[PDB]
Structures are given as C-alpha cells and as structure tokens.
Design a protein around this nucleic acid. Structure first.
Ligand SMILES: OC[C@H]1O[C@@](CO)(O[C@H]2O[C@H](CO)[C@@H](O)[C@H](O)[C@H]2O)[C@@H](O)[C@@H]1O
Ligand SMILES: [Mg+2]
Length: 580
DNA sequence: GCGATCAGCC
DNA sequence: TGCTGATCGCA
C-alpha cells in the first residue's frame, strides 16, 4: 500500500522540471513567520521529499521556486507563498491551486485539506491532515517517515487531480474564474497579509484604560441597582436578576432560559434603570474584550503590525473572510467604538490611509440582474435609493418622506437583498407579519422587475439545482425542494441573495486585480492593505493622494460594466478613522 | 474542548 | 444575507 518516493539529502536537477505538484507544508494554523516542516515534489521524473533546511538553502531550488516559467500545482498556495515571503523567498508560477478549484466547484463542501478535495473525485489514497497531525493540544508534527509519506501522498493527489478538476471547472464555465480571478487574487492577498497594517499600540492601550474606568463605574452602578453582585456576562445570572429579582417581563425566551439580547433589553428599559446600564456595560465590554484586548494580542511586538489572514475559500457567496484579527468587523456605527480605527495607521511616516467604498453595490447589481426599469432609472439619476423606495411604497412626493418612512424603506431594501421574508422584516421593524407583508407587496408593485427576478431565480434554482453569479461562481441549493417550510424557505432566500451578494464579491475581487495592475503600471508606491466586502483600504505616500483620488475610483467603477453605473466614494487621512 | 449566548459589520 | 469571536457553562 505504501507509496514510493525518494527521501533526498540533496536537491537534483531531476526535481526541477517545468511542471510539478509542490507541497511546502506549514502546520501552524496561522502561517505568518511560521515553520515550513517539509517539502514534497512530484513531477514526470518521480516523487521526492526534501528537508526544508536543505531545499530552502539550495540556490537551484530557490531559483526554481521563483521561476514563473516553472509551473507548480498546489493546495492553498497562499499559505506557502506567505510562509516563504517571511523567509525572504519568492514563490512564482503557481498555475493550479486545488483548494481554490474545490472551493469554486462547491463551496458547501467545506474543503480544508487535500484529502477532502480528493474525496470529491473518489480519490482516497491520502489521509486528512487532522488524522496525521492530530487536533488541539495534541496537534504535533510526526516523525520524518510519517511526515514524508503524508506530504508525498498529498503532492501525488494534487498531481493526479489537476486534470479532473480543471475539466469540471471548464464544463461549469468556471475555468477563467479560477485562472483569471481567484488564483491571481490569491497572490495579491498574500502580499496584503504579509505587508500587514501598522497599529498604534499606545493609542489602544490608552483607550483600554479609559474603558476599564467606565466599565468599573457602570459595573458598580449595576450591582447598586440590583442590590447585589453577580456575573453580568452570564445570561444565567443576569436572567435571575432581571426576570426574577426585579420581576421584569419576559418578552422572549431562549432554548436554555430567558433572553437578554440587546433588542429585548431596550424594550425593558422603561421598567428599570438597570437595563440601560446593562446595555452600556454590554457595549463597553464588547470593545474591550474583542477589540482592545483581542487586537493587542495579535499585534507583532517587533513591528507593531497585525497580519490578518484572508480566508479565500470559506464563504458560500464568494466573499472573503478575515481572522486573527478579523479586520472586517472593526466598529463604525457607534462613535465610541469607531474610535478604534484611529489605532490603524500608515506603516511609514508621511504616508496616509486611503479608503474607497462602493456605494450601494448590491442594490445596483440587483437593478442590473433584474433589469427593473424603475430601479435602474433610480441609480441612473443617482438618487437616494431609500428615499426613492419610500416615495414609491408609501406613494408620496420627496418632500413628504419623513425620517421614519425612509428608515422603514431602508429596512425593506436590506430585506430585498437578503431574500425578503415578511417574518424577518416584521421582526426587524418590530411590526406584524401581515404589515411587513403589506410593505413587501407595495415594493413589488413599484419594482415589478425585482419581483420577476425573485420568482424566476427560485424557479431556476429548483430547475438547475444551483444559482450563479456574474462571473459564474456557483452555489448548490439542494434544500430548495425540501418539504419542510423553514428549510425550504432558507434555500429560497439563498437563491435570491447569492447572485446579488456573490456578484458584488466577483466585482470587488476583479477591481482588486485591476487596481494592483494599474498601481504597478503607474509605478506608484501605494498598495492594498485590506478589503472589507464593498471597500478597499490602501496606504501610500502623501504625495500620491491626488493621483489615487482619480485612479482608485476609476479602476473600481470600471471593473465590470453593468446596466447601471457603479459609484465609489473615497476618503483619506492620517489614520483609518480619519479616512472618512 | 465545545454548546449556546451575545454582538461587531456587510 | 454572509461572517469571527467573545464569555459562559458544561463536559
Ligand atoms: O491557509 C488558510 C486556508 O487554510 C484553511 C484549511 O485548509 O484554514 C486554516 O487556516 C485558517 C487561517 O489560519 C484558520 O482560520 C482555519 O481554522 C484553519 O483550518 C482554509 O479554510 C483556508 O482557506
Ligand atoms: Mg459603502
């Protein structure tokens, strides 16, 4: 059963062919400045295992790694590329990434190792990483004999699976999606992660001290209002204090007990002064724990930078996700938490942060895909879409739109993109189902094309078994035929929402690729730092701001051509906060 | 370790 | 709608 391979003590020309499956193993989940525990190469000449200290010190091997004409097939090439960047070695020529290929074929499979991808094609001559390295506290690198065979088997699977995967991608019309979008983007993300974002730790440490003070006061007041001390962070102990000791009314329960969600507490605020304080405590504690302490734990002491990892093969819609830290959910709505962004600064003096965001890209994409005359005209006039929606559903002139009307029209617009549901809208606007239903019916009378799209996309999902995005990303929806109402309904909302959210993801990804190419052409020092779904954040010399003010929006607005214009807003300043 | 709870943004 | 991650409780 064992697989044959050469456990080489030195590198040979034989292992430097112009096409090969390459494995540069980094076991640590977070690959930044992490160890490369072994290398495996499989090509027309055979299978090889090389110790990293050997291969990575070899002039020939390193040159081969950096030679773009020498093609390599891999799994999660970004992980290897970044781990190599930290060692001052460039990886080029990656023409096929099995992780990205598997992700495009079916993001629902949750493929996270070679074994999982291989199983898609009935190939099982490779073990899952978890079985070899174990998990959690017991996750360790095995002895060389066990390690070497694993890396060789992974490289062998990659070598064998490339053709089958590329063939199915072609049939799905996703070959260009992999080769011209996801793979090139992978290299850009590697550069962004490696560059990192400079953090002002002193500023963070100072904010944390202020929060600590406020939490102290609010915490004491809470015990004062409750007549005793208890763990506020335990819904269990809070529930007894609120719904038992204070006799507050139970407006919602949870599988385990009483509900203490912010939405429920605000409705209880009028009854007791403790509720307001609990809410405030919830706010402060969130910033302190998740952002201040959480951010300070991942900043690198030597450079004062945070190096996030963009998971490119996780979301079911095509969006990127960010971890350690998640720089895609830094506070912005509330001012107190928004100030956390003052902590993100340029990596060099005399440099500034430049941020550009698409204005209502999802609604614009919807206007385009549904070809709704009213909605397309609205964006062609660059109207305030929420005010316009309010005018139509409530049948009033612009002057007649009140702040509450706009707020509700705004909530309807969000529902429409998420896959409208009279139940979900009702809960959100704190109104009845029938009323939420009335709003929805009114919306469809105003936007018949959108109604048509919603009906047709659900039908299509049932017919083909999946829905697609502008650049041909795909999402299978087997639950679309379920006889269970809740399960089937979720699938229907997914059918309505994916072409919208997914197409928006396709566009920003293409914009990143086009932008990176333009910056190089223009010889600008400016570079991408982060992406947050509908916005791109860069940093550059202060002398490049004027050129970026024209270049970035143009590149982003021209990424794709839709039936409606794409609009990009932009700002720049000394910190991320000031890039407003 | 792992669920159920909560809350941050898109 | 799509995410990450915190603290708690239990195991
Ligand atoms: O290298 C990122 C890439 O690896 C996967 C597993 O194949 O995720 C691993 O690394 C992430 C970043 O450290 C972790 O969040 C995740 O828990 C770990 O399994 C892929 O999902 C990802 O695309
Ligand atoms: Mg925006």
């Amino acid at each position: 059963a064992k697989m044959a391979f050469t456990l080489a003590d030195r590198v040979t020309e034989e292992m430097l062919a112009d096409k090969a499956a390459l494995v540069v193993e980094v076991v640590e989940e977070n690959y930044h400045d992490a160890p490369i525990v072994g290398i495996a190469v499989v090509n027309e000449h055979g299978r090889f295992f090389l110790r990293p200290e050997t291969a990575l010190a070899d002039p020939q091997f390193v040159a081969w790694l950096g030679d773009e004409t020498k093609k390599k097939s891999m799994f999660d090439s970004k992980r290897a590329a970044v781990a190599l960047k930290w060692k001052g070695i460039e990886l080029c020529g990656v023409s096929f990434d099995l992780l990205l290929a598997a992700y495009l074929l079916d993001p629902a499979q949750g493929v996270d190792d070679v074994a999982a991808a291989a199983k898609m094609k009935q190939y099982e001559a490779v073990r899952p990483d978890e079985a070899v390295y174990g998990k959690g506290a017991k996750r360790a690198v095995p002895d060389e004999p066990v390690l070497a065979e694993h890396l060789v088997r992974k490289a062998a699977a990659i070598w064998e699976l490339e053709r089958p995967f590329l063939d199915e991608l072609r049939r799905n019309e996703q070959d260009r999606l992999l080769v011209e979008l996801e793979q090139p983007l992978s290299s850009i993300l590697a550069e962004m992660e490696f560059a990192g974002v400079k953090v002002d730790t002193k500023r963070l440490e100072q904010m944390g001290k202020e929060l600590a003070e406020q939490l102290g006061t609010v915490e004491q007041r809470i015990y004062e209002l409750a007549g005793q001390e208890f763990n506020i962070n335990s819904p269990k102990q809070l529930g007894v204090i609120l719904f038992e000791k204070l006799q507050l009314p139970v407006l919602k329960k949870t599988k385990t007990g009483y509900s203490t969600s912010a939405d429920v507490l605000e409705k209880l605020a009028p009854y007791h002064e403790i509720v307001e304080n609990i809410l405030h405590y919830r706010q402060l504690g969130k910033l302190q724990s998740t952002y201040i302490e959480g951010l300070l734990k991942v900043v690198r002491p030597d450079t004062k930078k945070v190096h996030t990892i963009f998971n490119q093969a996780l979301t079911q819609t095509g969006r990127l996700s960010s971890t350690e830290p998640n720089l895609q959910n830094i506070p912005i709505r509330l001012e107190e938490g928004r100030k956390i962004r003052q902590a993100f600064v340029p990596s060099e003096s005399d440099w500034l942060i430049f941020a550009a965001d698409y204005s209502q890209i999802e609604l614009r994409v919807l206007a385009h895909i549904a070809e709704d005359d009213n909605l397309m005209e609205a964006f062609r006039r660059d109207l305030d879409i929420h005010t316009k929606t309010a005018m139509d559903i409530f049948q009033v002139s612009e002057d007649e739109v009140t702040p509450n009307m706009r707020r509700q029209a705004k909530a309807v617009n969000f529902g429409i993109v998420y896959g409208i549901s009279d139940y979900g809208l009702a809960q959100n606007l704190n109104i009845s189902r029938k009323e939420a239903a009335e709003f929805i019916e009114r919306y469809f009378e105003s936007f018949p094309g959108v109604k048509r799209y919603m009906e047709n996309i659900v039908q299509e999902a049932k017919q083909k078994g999946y829905v697609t995005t502008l650049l041909h990303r795909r999402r299978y929806l087997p639950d679309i035929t379920s006889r269970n109402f809740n399960v089937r309904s979720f699938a229907e909302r997914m059918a309505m929402n994916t072409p919208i959210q997914g197409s928006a993801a396709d566009i920003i990804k293409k914009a990143m690729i086009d932008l990176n190419a333009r910056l190089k052409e223009e010889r600008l020092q400016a570079h991408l730092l982060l992406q947050v779904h509908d916005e791109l954040i860069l940093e550059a010399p202060k002398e490049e701001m004027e050129r970026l003010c024209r270049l970035v929006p143009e590149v982003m607005e021209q990424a794709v051509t839709l039936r409606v214009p794409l609009k990009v807003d932009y700002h720049y300043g000394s910190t991320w906060y000031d890039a407003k």
